């Protein structure tokens, strides 16, 4: 299933994902990071090649792994890299996760589960890149080392919104 | 969010017949749109969903390429154009909101507004 996760901010799945939507209206970020999600360091090549576009950024990590983290690596990423929204891609279903995050939570990030797989049509993930590119999205950026699956689904979604596709 | 649709009536078969259905609320709780259908004895059945920008549709296999879903949101208005009706195609016509993030666009249990439905009868 998914997570999508915001910071704290100044301002229940249904209320929930109204957050959540009026955040990627307000914010109009410019590109998207696809990223597996395991070598931070792969992040953080993608997020300066944006910085360096002057892009404002969500990331999407399609292969995420919890291990023994309960997401502070999540939490890291907000903080170094100022992302406005990160989406992770997981192997649980959808009550696992939302278990799961019950610890980001705790902290004051706000997040949102629902079901999925990366591989699977997902239609909720249709509406997070509609709604992006509605408010101004411009390019994906496809950060090194991703598997040919989202490699060829980051390809098709360029041509579905008429984004820029960076590699 | 009310729904209101419009359209219906008495067509013979391979002729066309276009629905309309106006929605009001938001753009958050019509973000997705959709077209159901049910005969006497049937279920409810999916037919045909619509994204806010339209840059993802659905159709039932049944449907398309006779179906044509399309929206104009500065009248937050959907509507269903039918070519090469069959009879089988007989039934009431509900258009139905469902949320952003709402989930499958096929399910009907993911849609929390409907509206009262247009009878469709195809001889």
Redesign the interface.
Same mark, same amino acid.
């Given at each position: 299933a998914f997570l999508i996760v915001k910071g704290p901010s100044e301002k229940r799945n249904?209320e929930k994902?109204?957050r959540?939507?009026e955040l990627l209206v307000r914010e109009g970020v410019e590109a998207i990071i696809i990223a597996r999600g395991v070598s931070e360091r792969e992040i953080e090549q993608a997020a300066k090649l944006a910085r360096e576009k002057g892009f404002e950024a969500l990331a999407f990590l399609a292969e995420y792994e919890r291990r023994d983290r309960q997401f502070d690596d999540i939490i890291e990423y907000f903080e170094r890299y100022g992302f406005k929204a990160v989406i992770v891609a997981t192997g649980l279903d959808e009550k696992e996760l939302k278990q799961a995050a019950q610890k980001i939570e705790e902290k004051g990030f706000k997040a949102?589960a629902?079901?999925g797989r990366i591989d699977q049509e997902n239609?909720?993930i249709?509406?997070?890149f509609?709604?992006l590119?509605?408010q101004g999205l411009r390019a994906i950026i496809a950060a090194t080392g991703l598997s040919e699956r989202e490699l060829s689904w980051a390809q098709r979604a360029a041509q579905?919104?008429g984004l820029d596709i960076i590699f | 969010v009310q729904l209101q649709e419009s359209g219906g009536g008495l067509v013979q078969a391979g002729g066309s017949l276009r629905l309309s259905c106006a929605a009001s609320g938001g753009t958050?709780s019509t973000?997705?749109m959709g077209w159901f259908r049910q005969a006497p004895g049937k279920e409810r059945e999916f037919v045909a969903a619509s &994204?806010?920008?339209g840059?993802?549709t659905?159709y039932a296999d049944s449907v398309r390429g006779r179906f044509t879903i399309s929206r104009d949101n500065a009248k937050n208005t959907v509507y269903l154009e039918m070519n090469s009706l069959k009879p089988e195609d007989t039934a009431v016509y509900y258009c139905a909101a469902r949320?952003?993030?709402?989930? &499958?666009?096929f399910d009907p249990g993911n849609y929390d507004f409907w509206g009262q439905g247009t009878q469709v009868t195809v001889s």
């Open positions: 249904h994902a109204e959540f939507f949102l629902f079901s239609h909720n249709n509406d997070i509609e709604l590119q509605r579905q919104y | 958050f973000y997705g &994204s806010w920008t840059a993802n659905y949320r952003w993030l709402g989930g &499958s666009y």
